[PDB]
Structure formats: C-alpha cells, structure tokens
C-alpha cells in the first residue's frame, strides 16, 4: 500500500510493544521539566543549607540529562538492531538507503515528539507535586503555586530535540554501515580461562569486602593511605563484579547442574539455559546496572542515616538547647526570655584543656588515630560541674559514646591514664563508656570525649593551667527552657541576637543538617528512581530479545507434552533468577559499603537501610513481573 | 465464584487502592491540607466501597450464574433477561446461534422426509 | 462501542467520582481545608482516572466487540481467546453451543446415511 499507511501501522506496533519505553520517555520528560521549573521557581530560595538550592538543582538537572540521554541512546540502539531484519528486507525490496531512513525517521518522529508533548503536559501537572515533596523533605513552610514557565518549556524542548538529533545521526550511520548481507557453538564446556576468570571474580569481590571491614579499623593512618585504599576497593569491586558476570556466574551455574546430576525438572531447564550463556553476553551492561544501583542505594541510605540521626547529631554537637560564646550576649538573651514569661536555666560549666597520655590504655597500636595519643587536647570537666556519677581521687570517667569515636578510639575498661599539664603530671584511672555528653563540640573535638576528675584535683591545678592549650571560652553557657513547644518561640527570638552568626543553636544546627541532607536525599532519590525506571526498561528489552531467541526451545517443549501452565512456572523461576542475581549482588555491594561508613554519618543504620532495599526491591520487581507477562504471551503464540 | 469476581475486577480494585494511595500521599506531603481528616474519610470511603463492591457483585454476577444452564439437561431453563449492553450482546449472539440450531434441525427434518 | 462501555460501567465511574465530588463539598465547607490545593489534588486523580478508563476500555471491550462476529453472517471463523474468568464462562457456553450443534448435526447425518 501507500508508504503513509505503513508508517501508521508501524507506529501502532511500536506503541503496543515498547510501551515501557514510551512510559520511561514520558517520565523522563516530565521529571526534567519539573526540575527545570523548580530551578527557576522563586520559592526555592526559601531553603537554607551549605549548598545553594538553585545550584544543587542545576547539577541534578545536568546529571538527569546524562542519565536519560545514555538510556535513550542505548534503547534506540537496540531498537534498530532488532529492526535490522526488516531493514535488510527493505533494501532487498528496491528502495534506496534514503527512503528507508525516511520511513524509520517518520515513525520515530511521530512517536518521540508525541511522547514529548505528553511529557510536557505531565511535567506541568507534577511540577507542584515535586515542589511540595522537596519542601516537606527539607521541612520548610511556604506556599507552592502551579505556574507554567516559558524558559522551562524552551529548555526541555532544546535538550530533547538535541537528543533526538543524536538519535537521527546514530540511526543514519547504522543504515549506511549495514549492507544488504545483514538479514541472514554457544553451548560448550568450561575452559581453563573461564576457570581463572570465575575464581578471580569471587576472590576480588571478597577481597574488596574484607578491606571495607577493616577500612577504618586503624590499619591506615594518613589520608593518602585512606584515599589509595578507597581507589583500590572501588577498583576491586568493579573488576570483581565484571568478572562475576563474565565467568563466575557460568561456573556457579555449572557446579549446581553437575551436583544435581542428570535429573533436572522443567524449572531447571529454562533457568539454566539462560544464565549459563546469556549473562556473559551482556556482562558490561549488567555490571554498569549493578554498580550504579549499588551506588544509588548506598548514597540514599547514607543520606537517610544522617537525616534520621540529624536531631540526635544536632543534640550531639551541643550540650543544651542553646550555646553561648560570651557572657554579655547571655545577659542580653536571658532578659529577653525573662520578659517572655518562659522559665529557663542557664548553666555555667568551666572546662579545662591540656595534654593527656591516653596511649597507656589505648588498645592495640596507638597509630590508628590521626594524631598523637600522648599529646592531644582533651576537655577536662570538674566533678561539681555536672550531676552524674561521683568520682573519687585517682579516678576518671569518659563521657560521650559517639559510635565513630569508639571505632577510631578503641577504649579499654581498665588501666592508668596520664595527664601531662604545664607542670608535674598526675596519674589517673578511667572506666569510660558513658552516654551523656557534658561538653559541646565547640571546645572539644567532634568525636573527642571529655574526662571527669574529682573537684579537689580541679581546684588544685587552677593556678597551674596550660596557657598553650585553651581556646577562648573556658566556662560554657547552656540554656534550656520548659516543655517542648517553647523551642520555636525561643529560636525565633534567638535569631535576632546572633547577627554575626558567632553563636550556635541546637535548632539551627538541626535545621541546617536537615536541609542539606534532605536536598541530597531528594536529588539522589529522584535520580535513583529515574535510573531504576531506565535500568528496568533496558533489562525488559534485553529479555524481550532473549525471549524471541528462545522460541524454538518453547516449541520443542510444547511438542514434548509440557502444557503452557507448566512452562509458566519455569518461566517465573527463570525470570526470578534473571532479575534477582543483579539485585542480590547489588544489595550485597550496598550493604558492605554502608556497613563500612555508617558511623561517619549517624548512629542508627539498620532501620533506614533495610527500608531502602525493601522500597527498592518492591519498585524493581515490577519490571520482572512485566517481563513474565511478555514471556507468557510469547509461549502462548509459540504453538 | 468470589475468587472469580475478584479476579474480574482486580484492575478496578487496584485502581481504587492506588487512588487512595495517591489520596493519602498528596495529603501527607501537602502541609496546607490536614492528614487526620483525610485518614478518617478514607477509612469511611473504604468501608463504603466494600459495601458497594458486595452490592455490585450480587446484582451483576446473577446473569453469569444463570449461564450455567448448559452443564446438564437444565437447557430447558431460560436465561434471565440481561440489562447491561455487554450481556445484551452476549444474549443476542446466543439467541442467534440458537436460531441457527433451530433452522438446521428443520432443514435436516426437511431433507429426511423429502428423501423418504 | 464507547457508549455501550460507558453505560455498563456507569455505576463504577460514579463510585470513583463520588468521593471526588464529596471532597469538593467538604472542602467548600471546612475552613481547615484549603479548596485550591484540594482542587489540584482532585485534578491529579481525575487525570489518572481518565487515563485508566481509556486503557481499560480497549482491554474490556476487545472480547465483546469481536463477539459480534458470531452474531452476524460472517460466523465462519473463530474469535479471540478469553483471558479473564467472566468472559471465559461466556466462551465456555459458546464453545458448548458449537459442540452440541456439531454433535447433533453429525448424529443426524449418520442416521440419514444409515437408511440409504
């Protein structure tokens, strides 16, 4: 018939088959349009963090384009590759190489631009939703409005038109480089080279995991050693994962088949007919999917770990609801709260800074930590200063668990601790392992705890105090107020006091941490969600091509006597392995990466991390179910 | 047959559940609107939907229950008059083939006596 | 065909739109609930429902539209295989219709040939 009718019919088949690609394209266009709208939205300036909101969104916008253009270019590459059969037939019909390209371009234009127009409308509808999501995540109260911005529409049109220009170049160069002769064993034993590759892949993966388990144990001392170790473990995991998909997966599949003997059920035929010979054909694609998914899960879990513990960490860095550097501002602030009929308590806790030899009780080598245990600045608090546990003469206590502290500083339960002041040193003894933190991190280090000494010794060395080791403050001012609802009124009144931002408030530190890590979680979570859609669609298309390659096997099985329902169970198990192996290794990479750095961010790691995989697995199994439905259709039409 | 009707309307069941999932998600994310009032109303709406689902099943599946007249010699029993357009087309096709069965029996009876 | 599909599913689309209509009533009367944000929230669900309705139209009417072949005089071919239990029972009755007709014709033909 006429060429136009053929183009329309081809579009209908493409829409029916690649419906996931259209949804992914619409989702990518809609999400990108919302992100650009958020970048130029004047209401986004209400967020306050270390990184500017506009700059962070723009960086995410560039990353979103890269993660989408790569998926779109790869998806179109395999679309033409699977269409090469009809490409050669058209060349055999008699049309020139330009008319066939025109037909392919016309069908692509009517589909790509149609989804782009729908995606723009979808992006306009969801622009308010993503803005409200960001505001809720970073905990800011403002008014979100639904508006259409001309610049956002122009930017997304230019970017996606340029992306399609790359598609047209790729499609044109594929037609020209393919001649007429284009429309016309895999099973073998395991070789010695496959033996070495398989063993090396597992060895490299476990070697990287073991290094992570001992990354912060104290083996490395300098920052350069830590950085070179990080490069080594990243390289080992990537190489190990690539070798795992190349030869290791074949050996594990070969081993179980040999162990099972020659008695294989229907489920063991389809499952073992793909992972032995098809996993290694696309090792690079699987490795990239696994690596990025593990990185996305790891980054998201770590950001959620900090977000979950942000309030605890804000309470960690402080000692009360407020911290004051000078007495004059405290006098100004106390009068402001006094006239506000709110009861408050101001505590004055002098602290002492000196050098203490803790290496005598430092378990193992004293080179694990960054510095000298013999000469290091430790906060000293008098016994009368706090109301915890009374300390007798010749005894000491260490306050502040700070889990990161324990790993770096592996404290013991008994020993002799040596304090080296400006004058004659005195020997003490400590137990440690406390919770309540008596000193804010403005004098002592972020993880360094504070030693408690009997007040008799503290009053004794008042005349002999090291002038070398003392920052500015000595006495510490902490202000707390009654109930909990008074936090907001105190915080809003405290804002006008620290005009130079020289003070430090618990609420302000929590809010800054909430906004900074919330923005990172928002960026990583949405980018990971986009990658999840693209990776699932790519794997769905790979299974689509593999399904057509396994059609003769299904025809033989049906002719043998196996029913369609019997093959459904085998397909479900096979698809579970195909969509589960990348997920299982991906989760293992994320779990061992989080377990090696969770203490650097927060204190609770189990609950936030488990939720991330559970959410990720649930949203990842949808593509596996869709692949099963396509497989059910294929085997139904097989015979 | 409960397991059959639920599979029939599993798409509509999921759509209503997804609508409520979106209904909760927007209310939770958006600070201007409350979430407690939406939660209470959703529970009331789900309870009303369950009652409506049972009422819809009883009225609609009655026609397909009577379609089991061909299991045995119950063929003499008449199919209940349909109301929905989908069932009306089904009944029209069944009636058309029934007349097809009637006319071929008459044609054979005509042929049998003509040959005599 | 669209008119027939909408007439059948009139009760279901009314149930979906009843809760949306309910919100536009309480929001218009509840000071604690902003009407503007609810209107966008309702609009998002309406957009989803319209897309869902269009997707379900082709899926839920493909079998019944093809069933019109049996009714007319082009009944010399087969129809699409059923995929859901309710239309499977309709196909089962249709399949039982042809088998009984084929059995009756074969038996009558054998009797006619036996007396020759």
């Amino acid at each position: 018939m006429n060429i136009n009718q053929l183009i329309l019919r081809n579009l209908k088949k493409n829409l029916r088959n690649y419906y996931l690609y259209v949804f992914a394209l619409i989702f990518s266009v809609a999400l990108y349009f919302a992100f650009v709208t958020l970048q130029y939205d004047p209401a986004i300036n209400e967020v306050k963090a270390s990184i500017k909101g506009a700059a962070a969104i723009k960086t995410a916008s560039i990353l979103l384009v890269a993660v989408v253009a790569i998926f779109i270019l790869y998806a179109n590459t395999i679309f033409i590759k699977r269409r090469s059969k009809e490409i050669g037939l058209f060349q055999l019909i008699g049309m020139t190489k330009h008319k066939i390209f025109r037909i392919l371009s016309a069908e692509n234009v009517m589909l790509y631009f149609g989804s782009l127009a729908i995606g723009v409308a979808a992006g306009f509808s969801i622009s308010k939703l993503v803005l409200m999501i960001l505001f809720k995540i970073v905990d800011v109260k403002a008014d979100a409005k639904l508006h259409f911005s001309e610049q956002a529409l122009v930017q997304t049109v230019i970017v996606f038109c340029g992306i399609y220009l790359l598609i047209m170049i790729m499609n044109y160069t594929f037609i020209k480089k393919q001649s007429i002769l284009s429309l016309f064993d895999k099973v073998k034993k395991i070789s010695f080279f496959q033996m070495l590759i398989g063993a090396l892949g597992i060895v490299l993966i476990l070697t990287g995991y073991y290094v992570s388990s001992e990354l912060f144990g104290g083996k490395f001392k300098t920052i350069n050693e830590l950085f070179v170790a990080m490069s080594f473990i990243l390289g080992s995991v990537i190489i190990g994962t690539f070798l795992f998909y190349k030869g290791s997966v074949t050996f594990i599949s070969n081993i179980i088949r040999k162990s099972k003997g020659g008695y294989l059920n229907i489920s063991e035929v389809l499952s073992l007919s793909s992972i032995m010979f098809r996993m290694k054909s696309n090792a690079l694609l699987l490795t990239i999917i696994t690596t990025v998914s593990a990185l996305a899960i790891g980054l998201l879990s770590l950001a959620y770990i900090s977000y979950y513990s942000s309030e605890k960490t804000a309470e960690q860095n402080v000692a009360a609801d407020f911290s004051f550097m000078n007495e004059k501002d405290a006098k100004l602030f106390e009068n402001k709260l006094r006239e506000s009929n709110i009861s408050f308590v101001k505590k004055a806790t002098p602290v002492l800074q000196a050098n203490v030899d803790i290496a005598n009780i430092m378990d193992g080598t004293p080179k694990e930590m960054q510095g000298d245990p013999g000469n290091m600045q430790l906060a000293v608090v008098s016994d009368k200063d706090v109301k915890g546990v009374d300390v007798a003469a010749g005894e000491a206590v260490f306050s502040g668990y700070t889990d990161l502290l324990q790993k770096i500083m592996v404290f013991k339960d008994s020993g002799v601790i040596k304090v080296k002041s400006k004058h004659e040193t005195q020997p003490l003894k400590y137990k440690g392992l406390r919770e309540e933190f008596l000193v804010s991190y403005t004098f002592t280090s972020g993880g360094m705890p504070a030693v408690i000494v009997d007040d008799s010794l503290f009053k004794q060395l008042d005349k002999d105090k090291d002038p070398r080791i003392q920052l500015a403050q000595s006495t510490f001012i902490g202000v707390n107020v009654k109930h909990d609802d008074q936090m907001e009124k105190a915080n809003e009144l405290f804002q006008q006091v620290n005009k130079k931002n020289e003070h430090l408030s618990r609420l302000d530190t929590s809010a800054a941490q909430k906004s900074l890590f919330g923005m990172v979680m928002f960026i990583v979570g949405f980018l990971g969600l986009t990658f999840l859609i693209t990776s699932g669609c790519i794997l769905y298309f790979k299974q689509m091509g593999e399904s057509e390659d396994e059609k003769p096997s299904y025809t033989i099985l049906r002719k043998l006597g196996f029913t369609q329902g019997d093959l459904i169970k085998g397909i479900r198990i096979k698809q579970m392995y195909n969509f589960g192996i990348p997920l299982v290794v991906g989760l293992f990479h994320s779990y061992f990466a989080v377990q090696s750095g969770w203490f650097l961010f927060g204190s609770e790691v189990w609950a936030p991390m488990i939720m991330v995989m559970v959410l990720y697995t649930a949203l990842y199994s949808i593509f596996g179910f869709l692949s099963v439905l396509y497989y059910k259709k294929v085997i139904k039409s097989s015979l | 047959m409960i397991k059959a009707f639920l599979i029939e309307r599993r798409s509509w069941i999921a759509a209503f559940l997804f609508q409520q999932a979106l209904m909760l998600f927007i209310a939770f994310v958006d600070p201007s609107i409350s979430f407690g009032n939406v939660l209470y109303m959703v529970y009331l709406c789900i309870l009303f939907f369950i009652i409506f689902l049972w009422f819809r099943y009883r009225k609609e599946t009655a026609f397909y229950k009577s379609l089991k007249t061909w299991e045995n010699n119950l063929d003499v029993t008449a199919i209940n008059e349909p109301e929905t357009p989908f069932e009306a087309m089904v009944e029209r096709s069944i009636a058309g083939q029934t007349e097809h069965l009637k006319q071929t029996a008459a044609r054979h009876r005509l042929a049998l006596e003509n040959e005599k | 065909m669209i008119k027939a599909f909408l007439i059948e599913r009139r009760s279901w689309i009314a149930a979906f739109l009843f809760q949306q209509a309910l919100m536009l009533f309480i929001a218009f009367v509840d000071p604690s609930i902003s009407f503007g944000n609810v209107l966008y929230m309702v609009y998002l669900c309406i957009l989803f429902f319209i897309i869902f309705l269009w997707f379900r139209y082709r899926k839920e009417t493909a079998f019944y539209k093809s069933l019109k072949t049996w009714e007319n005089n082009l009944d010399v071919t087969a129809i699409n295989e059923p995929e859901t239990p309710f239309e499977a029972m309709v196909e089962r009755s249709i399949a039982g219709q042809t088998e009984h007709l084929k059995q009756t014709a074969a038996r009558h033909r054998l009797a006619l040939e036996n007396e020759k």
């Binding site: 099973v187 003997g261 008695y263 294989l264 | - | 084929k102």
Partner: protein, 239 residues
C-alpha cells in the same frame, strides 16, 4: 487389547471414513499407504492432537476422546510415548538430562531415576554418550536418545511417525533392531508409520489405509525376513 477404534472418522478434508483398529500388548505393527492418503492423520487422531468428529477410540480401556484439556494432558504425559522423525532435542541440555526430561513431572527419587536410565541406556547402546551435548553427536545418536526418551517411563502405546525419516540405511537398521529388541524385552506395544517397507519389515502385522478405509491384515506368520520382505513389497506394489 489396549487399543480399540469403533468406526473412527474425521470430517475434515474427508480423510477418515470409519476404520476398526485393535492391537494386542507387545505387538509391532505399522500403518502406511500413499502420500497424502491419511496415513499421517491416523497418528494425529489416535493420539489426542486434533481430536475427532466421528467415531470413538479406546486406550487401555480408558476413553481416548470426549474429555476436556485438563486430564487429557496427564494422559499423554503418562500413558503415551512419542518418537518424532525430527529429533526434537534441546541443545542446552545434554543426553542425560534430555532423556530424563519427561520423568521429572513424575517426581521420583534420583536413586531410581539413575537406575531406569542405566537399564534404558545399556539396552540402547548409548551409555557412552551420557554426557555429550546433541551438537557433538551424530544424527543416529540423536534419534536413539529420542527413542530412549519415549521409552524411559514405560508407557502403554508409543507412536513413531516415520522414526527413520532422516537416517541412513545402517542407522535405520540399527535403530529398528534396537526398537524391536526393546519391545520384546519390555512388552510395550509400539505403532509407527513408514514410507519404506524396510523399516516396517520388523513388524508383526501390517495394515494399509487410504481415503479412510481398511485393507487386509498382513500377519507375520513367524518366518524369516526374506518371506516378509517380499510379501510386503508385492502387496505395496499391487496397492
């Protein structure tokens, strides 16, 4: 008897017009005729492949027709064996797991499964190729392992639509000798269709069909191959 047909007739075409068929346990019989005369269609109707419009068929006393598609699947997978002319093997599976493909659904212990295979393989001369993929073995072995797959679960009636359809003269003789010996030592009745009298010479009863009619009952008579080979040749030429 284990097979009985009461005027089986297929209305499609008309290929079958009513033929009475019956065999005894442990019998080697062949049905043939002219090309396109319906010899192939008998195997598709005796087995439940396209059912039938007229007539009834009995297998081991159980009805072979008038059943739905649920219990019909169990019947073929339990009491019926198939020896296709095409190999119908799997390249991903070796000979060992290809032979024990249909025995998996029975779900028996591996101890007895490895014993049934040993008895079958030693009786077929295919033991040495227990772990060789189909692409690494000759066509004769591919047909032999196909026959072993049909004989692994010891069925009642096995259909062999031209088993020697792609085998040489030596391979056909070897396969027929193995099948005849296998039937004698297992007392499992097999039927087949053959386009050449050489393959059907190992039978005990030969009956020919065309346009759905039954002609003659060529009993073996218990003599050597020389008498039977000439008798089947002259009858086929006359027919």
């Amino acid at each position: 008897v284990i097979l009985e047909a009461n005027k089986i007739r297929k209305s499609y075409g008309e290929v079958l017009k009513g033929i009475d068929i019956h065999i005894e346990k442990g019998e080697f019989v062949s049905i043939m005729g002219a090309s396109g005369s319906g010899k192939t269609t008998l195997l598709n109707v005796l087995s439940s492949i396209d059912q039938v419009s007229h007539g009834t068929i009995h297998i081991n006393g159980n009805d072979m027709t008038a059943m739905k598609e649920k219990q019909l699947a169990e019947f073929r997978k339990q009491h019926l064996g198939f020896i296709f002319q095409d190999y119908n093997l799997l390249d991903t599976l070796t000979v060992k797991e290809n032979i024990l493909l249909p025995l998996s659904i029975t779900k028996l212990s591996k101890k007895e499964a490895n014993r049934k295979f040993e008895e079958v393989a030693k009786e077929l001369g295919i033991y040495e190729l227990r772990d060789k993929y189909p692409n690494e073995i000759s066509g004769g072995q591919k047909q032999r392992t196909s026959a072993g797959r049909a004989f692994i679960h010891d069925p009642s009636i096995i259909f062999a639509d031209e088993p020697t359809g792609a085998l040489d003269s030596k391979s056909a003789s070897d396969l027929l000798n193995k099948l005849s010996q296998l039937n004698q030592k297992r007392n499992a009745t097999i039927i087949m269709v053959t386009h050449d009298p050489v393959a059907a010479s190992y039978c005990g009863r030969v009956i020919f069909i065309k346009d759905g009619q039954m002609y003659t009952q060529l009993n073996k008579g218990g003599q050597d191959r020389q008498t039977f080979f000439q008798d089947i040749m002259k009858t086929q030429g006359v027919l």
